[PDB]
Amino acid sequence: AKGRGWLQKARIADEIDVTGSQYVNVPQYDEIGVLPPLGRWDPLNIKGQGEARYRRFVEMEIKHGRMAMAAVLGVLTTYSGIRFPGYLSKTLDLKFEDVPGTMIGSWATVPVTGWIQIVLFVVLLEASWWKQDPAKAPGDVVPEGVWWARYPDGYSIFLGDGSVKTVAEDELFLGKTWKLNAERNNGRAAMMGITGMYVHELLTGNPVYPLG
Amino acid sequence: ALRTRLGEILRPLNAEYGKVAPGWGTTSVMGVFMALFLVFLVIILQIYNSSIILENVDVDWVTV
């Protein structure tokens, strides 16, 4: 017995016009990353360098933005003083609290054997596990069955009464295109953010130099 | 009518005029939140009124 029969009865009916008739649905932002303010901002015309060369740049922006988002959150956490409990290296007597939260301070104090384990995990992810499929969408490197939050078109959300709403890809804050765009834009902003935090640290020792 | 850069940007946000959920919709959920809000407003009124005396909160001027 399939356990999904209650979903259709809990599903909210399709939205109509106030008069009673069916609603008429009635633009230039089709690709993820093409947003209202600038549209398609391509000063170097990388899209004109070939479809293979443009597919490379989409995955390249997605990957660069994903590491930069994690890098920005890492510095903001460690420079604030938040640390894991315990030891980073019991052999080297390296507690988490002893390591500086600054970018250059944490880069030097973390042992190179410890840094190798981070790099090898990225190498293992890049070369075997999370490999980009040419048929799959750019940035979709997590395979099936690895428990990833997915937002397919028409996925279910639930209200207070138990009613079920299906979320299209064009829905605000909940569609796939919104979350795909927000990943790209936060990746773009963190890309400029992480290099700005690097140079402000190089000049003043403070990654967020005006603040603090 | 005039088409502007910001007007084209904000156009989908004003494109769903007259669209409704058929029937009663989510009115039952709304009534529950209204009822919970009414009970909550009575609680903070009666706390201020000292009609509800809590465990160790005192409706009086506090220090620091």
Binding site: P37, P210, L211 | R5, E8
Partner: peptide, 30 residues
């Protein structure tokens, strides 16, 4: 008190950002 919370940096960057976006959206379409 001056220099707290970035000093004049965030108001200058914030006002410059608002002025730049208004100028970017000021032109007519097509």
């Amino acid at each position: 008190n001056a220099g707290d919370f970035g000093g004049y940096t965030i108001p200058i960057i914030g006002l410059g950002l608002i002025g730049a976006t208004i100028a970017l959206l000021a032109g007519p379409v097509d």
